[PDB]
Structure formats: structure tokens, C-alpha cells
RNA sequence: GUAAAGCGCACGCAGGCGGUUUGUUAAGUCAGAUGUGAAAUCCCCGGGCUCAACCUGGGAACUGCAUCUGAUACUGGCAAGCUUGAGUCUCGUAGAGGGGGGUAGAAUUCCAGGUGUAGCGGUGAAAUGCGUAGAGAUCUGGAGGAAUACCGGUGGCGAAGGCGGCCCCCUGGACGAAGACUGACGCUCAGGUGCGAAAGCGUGGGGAGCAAACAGGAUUAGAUACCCUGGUAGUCCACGCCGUAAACGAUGUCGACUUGGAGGUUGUGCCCUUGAGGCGUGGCUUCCGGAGCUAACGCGUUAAGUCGACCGCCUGGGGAGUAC
């Protein structure tokens, strides 16, 4: 856990008694996130990935937010991996059998603009179809891939992410989320507490899980 | 006020409980602990302990199992301007057994079942179910 | 309330010794002062209900507390009545 | 809480309940036993009428009352203490808390006079009304009554009602601090006692402004109203009476536990106090809100959450808080 040196604490004094047993300070007002108990299940809970992530566990990796958006998609398509950085839909998960539609659509369509099946009819209808690739990959994209709900699941922050965690545990599958101080963990039976951004932070456990799921396939 | 010590004790530990709390403490007294003990000898508390030598203190550490807490119900019986005192075949059988009822007997503050077999009656207290 | 000397002197003169304010026959005497004084200025305003209420709440206390020595001490009870003149 | 329902609030007798340790007792409490608890019913097992209803053998039951023998944890009696409950003291803390007496300035109206001239006032317009007997406006002097702009707020005090200028006098309560002291002296309380907004009633005062009544004027189909011009009671005061309110948090009191965040109020401990700055830690008080509770709205450590002691009240709507 030396790393752990790089993303320590985060958040004033908003935090929630629920993630008090995990501080390890205050200092400066701003909680310490408790890497002592951190590490514990930095690796415990890191490595019950590993295993359904062994027969092509489909690891859904979460997080819109700014920072780990751009990089959910390098750390998740490392390999089968799954992941999502475009605001969770409203059911993608739960409602997969009617989500899975625009799945569909994005393939077909993004075949139209792949070979020689786009170019054709009035500049109108033609620049309208390839608006919407310009959109349903920004979401589909890191699923579209995927057959159907995916063998476990693992967020970055669960406070801003909350919809994906519902629909997660809603349908029964497991969630991995590093939400720090002001975060319910109840969401999540595998808490990893550790700034819900950071530079570090994100890119750190993003690249370090992964491990464990792309290259701890056999 | 304080009218009935023995009530506080019971609803000390239920909302611990449900408070997720580690122990409880609470000024302790002969039949305080010896309920207390009841509760131990059985399986409802992680263990107990008198603190403070001229000031009773109790360290009654509440038990937890798997995704939920020990006590599940844990109400008064014998309370007071309305004390119950019941014969041997006249105990209660709290959760067809599952439970417990803590009765006052002439012997000490045994269990339903307890007394019971021992074949004497005793004033209720509780039923830590 | 009542005047530091009267208090303290009052106190003396009824403590089971010395700086025992808390004795109860003490208590007692300290009470009734105040109350047989508040006589003069209840007896004129008159309409001074809120001050009432003292006088009325430490009255009943007096009761309240002979009633205690009485029952935990038969003997300083019908004493202290005396050096103060009490029961009708 | 809003459905029926928290007494307007306090104090407190009876009554109910009673922190803590040991000894003692053994009344309640438990056990054992002996009486008595009529038989028949009921119940179980078993018989007799071809069965069944029915009749019957035995037992159980008779929840009970008493006596005797014990058991002593618990309630109770007693004796002895204990200190955390309650209270006493010292010291401070803030305050529209109360009764009494003063007192200042701002304005209103009224009176007198100076100046000045044809309006003023009022409305949606108006009109009544007040003005040449000189208003209004303006200035000067004076008379008097009621209320205290600003500060002032999510503020403070109080049992409730309620309580704002300043000054003094008499006076009650709340809070923190360190401790010193008494030693369960406590909580609750039917009846009872006392306090009770406004309006109202009595006697005698006072009376500027506002204003039920009443009187005009306008509005309108009408307008016993809203609006305008006046204006009596009253409002103010002293003592007495009346006891009601959406007397409302529509939420009885006392005690104990149950995650948090934000802010007001006042006390106290500490920090280069070098600062108002920072940290704590008491009482009070707003706002958001989790668990849980809720029919929902919502409440939420100031609960309507989780419990305990005591009290009040509810039992369909109308008739009716009416009659007697
Ligand atoms: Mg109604
Ligand atoms: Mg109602
Ligand atoms: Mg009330
Ligand atoms: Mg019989
Ligand atoms: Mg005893
Ligand atoms: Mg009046
Ligand atoms: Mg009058
Ligand atoms: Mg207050
Ligand atoms: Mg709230």
C-alpha cells in the first residue's frame, strides 16, 4: 500500500457517518481517508475480481465524471473489460433487453460508416445518421460489445454513480466502487474508500484492478 | 426519573443494536448485571463487565452475527405499577423456545426454561427473544 | 434574595457545625427568611403574581422539606419548629 | 399534529410509581403439604341401550379461599449507610420576567396669536364635510392623552397568558463555573388553589388618536356592507367581577438512550490569545435531514424514533357543547 501515498484523503466535512470507520484524519479540515484499512481490501476485495474475471469476466468499469471518463475507457478496454464514461441510461443495465435496441442500431450503423454503405442521399439524412454514432458510441460504445449483463461490475465513485450501482445490485450483480468520506458504502459489498478522483487516485486502482482482471486471466 | 433501572438496561441494548454500536455502558447494579449474565450465558451479548469502584459502570459489549444484529427483540415484562409474578407450569415460552424469558427466582434470575425444570416460579423481567 | 450576612450568619446558627449550607434544618431557616420577608413586599403591589410564584414554589418547598426531617428524624423536626415559631 | 380526542398554564393533598449498598424480615412472590372448593355439567379414557342422542365407572378440572412448612432473587416493612437524583451555599451571566414611582423626545389633536388668500379635504370618481365669520399651508407660545421610530433579529425573558424608550426602588426565575454541604428530601397528581388575550360588567377617574353603535355621503337592482365625512361605548387608569380564544407546536409532565450537517443566543476552559482569529466544552434556539415512525403530509437527539412513571381525553355524522 506505499502508492496508497498518492491520494490519501479528500472531501471537508460533508463526509457520512457511514464512512467514518475508514478516516484516517482531518487535517486542514478536509477527512484522511484511512489507507491503514484501506489496504486490507485493496487487495482482498481487488482480487475477488479476479476470479469470474478468469472464464472473460465481464468487469463493467463506471465513472462520467471529468478525470476518470477519458481514461475508464484505456483501463476497461485493456481486455474484455467492460466500461462506461458517458452518464449512465436509464435502464442499460436492468432494462438491457430494451437498451440492447440502440446496441443494435449503433452496430449497424456504425457498419454504414465503416465501409462502403454510408455514403449516399442528401447531405440531410445522411449527416443525420452519422450524428447519432457521434452519440450512441459515447455511451453503447464500451457495451456494444457485450451480450448481456456482465459477469460483475466495478465504479469509481458510487455518490455521483448511484443509478449504475441500483441497477446493478437490482438485477444481483456485485459492485466494486472507491467511494471516499461522502458516500453511501451500503451501495457496495466490496468498499474500497479512496478519493472519488484524484489524478492518481484514478488512474492508479483503474490500471490496478485491471491487472487482476485483463492480465489475471490465467 | 429513573423509576425502573431494569427497563434502561433492555432499551440501552436494543437500540445499540440497531445503532450498530459496540458495547453500551450504563451504571450497574446487583440485578443489572446479574440479568446481564443471563444474556451472556446464553448468546445475545459479546460478553459484560463491572467498571468504576465507587461509581458502577457496565461494559455490556453487544453480540452481532452475519448481516444483522444479535437481539431482534428485546422487550420489558415485570415492569413496575404493574409487576408480573407467575407460578412454574405458569411461564411464558418466549418464541416457542427460540427465545428467552429472564424470571426472578427465589434461586437467582434464571431462564424460562431454566426455573422451569428446576420447578419453582418466578417474577418475569423480559423477553430477549 | 437574601443578604449574604443574614445568609451566611442564618446558616451558623442552624448548621450541624460550621459551612454546611446544605443541612437541612438549615435550609429551613435560610427558606423561611425570604419568606416571612417577601410578606412586606407582597403585602404592598399586591399584584405582583410572578413574584408569587416564588414565594408559593419555596413555600411548598418548606413543606416539602419539614416533612422530610420529620419522617428521617422526629427529634430536629419538632425543634427547629420552634426556634422558628412554626405550625400555626 | 391534520381524521373523535393534550385540561389555557401552573402549585400541590389523597392516590400511583421510587436512584443505590449491605444486613434483617418474610407481607406480596415462588414451592411443598393439609384442608375446603357438593353432586350433576365440561373434558379424557372406558362401559351399557342394535347405533346415536341418552345413562354410567373412574380420573382430570374446579383458574379459587384459608392454614402449615419452607425459598429469598424481585416488590414491600425495618436498621445502617451511599451519591449519581433533587436541593443548599459561594461566585459570576444575560435578560421587552413582575409590582411601584418617576422621566425624555418624536408626532397627533386642540387653544391663542402673527403671516398669507381661495381653496383644503377626500375618491376609482365623487359627494357629505371644513373655507371670505379668512380655511388649508406657515411661524410662535401653550393644553393634554396615548404610544415608545431607530436599536430589533431566525433575538431575549416567562408556567401560561404574555412582556420593548430611559431612570431608580422592591422582586422572581433560568444558566455556567469550580468546588463546599444535606443525603432519595424524587417524578406525577383526580379533587382543591391560584394565575387567565381581547371583548364585556361595576364604581370612580381620564379621553389625543382610532373606533362597534349611530349619523350623513357615494356605490348598487338593492347595499341596514365594503369606500368617504363625523362619531358614542370602549380603548387608558385604580380596585373588584367575568373565566372564554385557531388560550396552537391544533404536539401533557418528568427521566434515559438513538447517525449527521449548517446557523443564532448566552456561560465557561484552553491557544505566539500575539487577532475579533483558533480549539474545545454547558443551557437555550432556528434550518436541513438519516434510521426509524406515519395513511400520506410529514416528525426526525427540542421526535411524532426507541423505552419507562403518572395524568387528561377519544369511541360515527347531524341533532348538540343544545335542553333539563
Ligand atoms: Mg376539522
Ligand atoms: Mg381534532
Ligand atoms: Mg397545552
Ligand atoms: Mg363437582
Ligand atoms: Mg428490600
Ligand atoms: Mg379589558
Ligand atoms: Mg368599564
Ligand atoms: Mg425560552
Ligand atoms: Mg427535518
Known amino acids: 500500500m506505499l502508492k496508497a501515498g498518492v491520494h490519501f484523503g479528500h472531501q471537508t466535512r460533508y463526509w457520512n457517518p457511514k464512512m467514518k470507520p475508514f478516516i484516517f484524519g482531518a487535517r486542514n479540515k478536509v477527512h484522511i481517508i484511512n489507507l491503514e484499512k484501506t489496504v486490507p481490501m485493496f487487495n482482498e476485495a481487488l482480487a475477488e475480481l479476479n476470479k469470474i474475471a478468469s472464464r472473460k469476466g465481464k468487469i463493467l468499469f463506471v465513472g462520467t465524471k471529468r478525470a476518470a471518463s477519458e481514461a475508464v475507457k484505456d483501463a476497461?478496454?485493456?481486455?474484455?473489460?467492460?466500461?462506461?464514461?458517458?452518464?449512465?441510461l436509464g435502464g442499460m443495465l436492468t432494462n438491457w433487453k430494451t437498451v440492447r435496441q440502440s446496441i443494435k442500431r449503433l452496430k449497424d450503423l456504425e457498419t454504414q460508416s465503416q465501409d462502403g454503405t454510408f455514403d449516399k442521399l442528401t447531405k440531410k439524412e445522411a449527416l443525420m445518421r452519422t450524428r447519432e454514432l457521434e452519440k450512441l458510441e459515447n455511451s453503447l460504445g464500451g457495451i456494444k460489445d457485450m451480450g448481456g449483463l456482465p459477469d460483475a461490475l466495478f465504479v469509481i465513485d458510487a455518490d455521483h454513480e448511484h443509478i449504475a450501482i441500483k441497477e446493478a445490485n437490482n438485477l444481483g450483480i456485485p459492485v466494486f466502487a472507491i467511494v471516499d468520506t461522502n458516500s453511501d458504502p451500503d451501495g457496495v459489498d466490496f468498499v474500497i474508500p479512496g478519493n472519488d478522483d484524484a489524478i492518481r487516485a484514478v488512474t492508479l486502482y483503474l490500471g490496478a484492478v485491471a491487472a487482476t482482471v485483463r492480465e489475471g486471466r490465467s | 426519573s429513573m423509576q425502573?433501572?431494569?427497563?434502561?438496561?433492555?432499551?440501552?441494548?436494543?437500540?445499540?443494536?440497531?445503532?450498530?454500536?459496540?458495547?453500551?455502558?450504563?451504571?450497574?447494579?446487583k440485578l443489572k448485571v446479574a440479568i446481564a449474565n443471563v444474556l451472556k450465558e446464553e448468546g445475545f451479548i459479546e460478553?459484560?463487565?463491572?467498571?468504576?469502584?465507587?461509581?458502577?459502570e457496565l461494559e455490556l459489549t453487544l453480540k452481532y452475527f452475519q448481516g444483522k444484529a444479535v437481539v431482534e427483540s428485546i422487550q420489558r415484562v415485570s415492569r413496575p405499577g404493574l409487576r408480573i409474578y407467575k407460578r412454574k407450569d405458569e411461564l411464558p415460552k418466549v418464541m416457542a423456545g427460540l427465545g428467552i424469558a429472564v424470571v426472578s427466582t427465589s434461586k437467582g434470575v434464571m431462564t424460562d426454561r431454566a426455573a422451569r425444570q428446576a420447578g419453582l416460579g418466578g417474577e418475569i423481567i423480559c423477553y430477549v427473544a | 434574595?437574601?443578604?449574604?450576612?443574614?445568609?451566611?450568619?442564618?446558616?451558623?446558627?442552624?448548621?450541624?457545625?460550621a459551612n454546611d449550607t446544605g443541612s437541612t434544618e438549615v435550609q429551613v431557616a435560610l427558606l423561611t427568611a425570604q419568606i416571612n420577608h417577601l410578606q412586606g413586599h407582597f403585602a404592598?403591589?399586591?399584584?405582583?403574581?410572578?413574584?408569587?410564584?416564588?414565594?408559593?414554589?419555596?413555600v411548598?418547598?418548606?413543606?416539602?422539606?419539614?416533612?422530610?426531617l420529620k419522617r428521617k428524624d422526629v427529634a430536629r423536626y419538632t425543634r427547629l419548629i420552634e426556634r422558628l415559631g412554626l405550625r400555626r
Open chain 3, 1 to 17: 434574595s437574601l443578604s449574604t450576612e443574614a445568609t451566611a450568619k442564618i446558616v451558623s446558627e442552624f448548621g450541624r457545625d
Open chain 3, 44 to 58: 404592598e403591589h399586591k399584584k405582583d403574581h410572578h413574584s408569587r410564584r416564588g414565594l408559593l414554589r419555596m
Open chain 2, 4 to 29: 425502573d433501572p431494569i427497563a434502561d438496561m433492555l432499551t440501552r441494548i436494543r437500540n445499540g443494536q440497531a445503532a450498530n454500536k459496540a458495547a453500551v455502558t450504563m451504571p450497574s447494579s
Open chain 3, 60 to 68: 411548598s418547598q418548606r413543606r416539602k422539606l419539614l416533612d422530610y
Open chain 1, 76 to 88: 476497461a478496454l485493456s481486455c474484455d473489460q467492460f466500461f462506461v464514461n458517458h452518464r449512465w
Open chain 2, 47 to 56: 460478553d459484560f463487565k463491572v467498571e468504576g469502584d465507587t461509581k458502577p
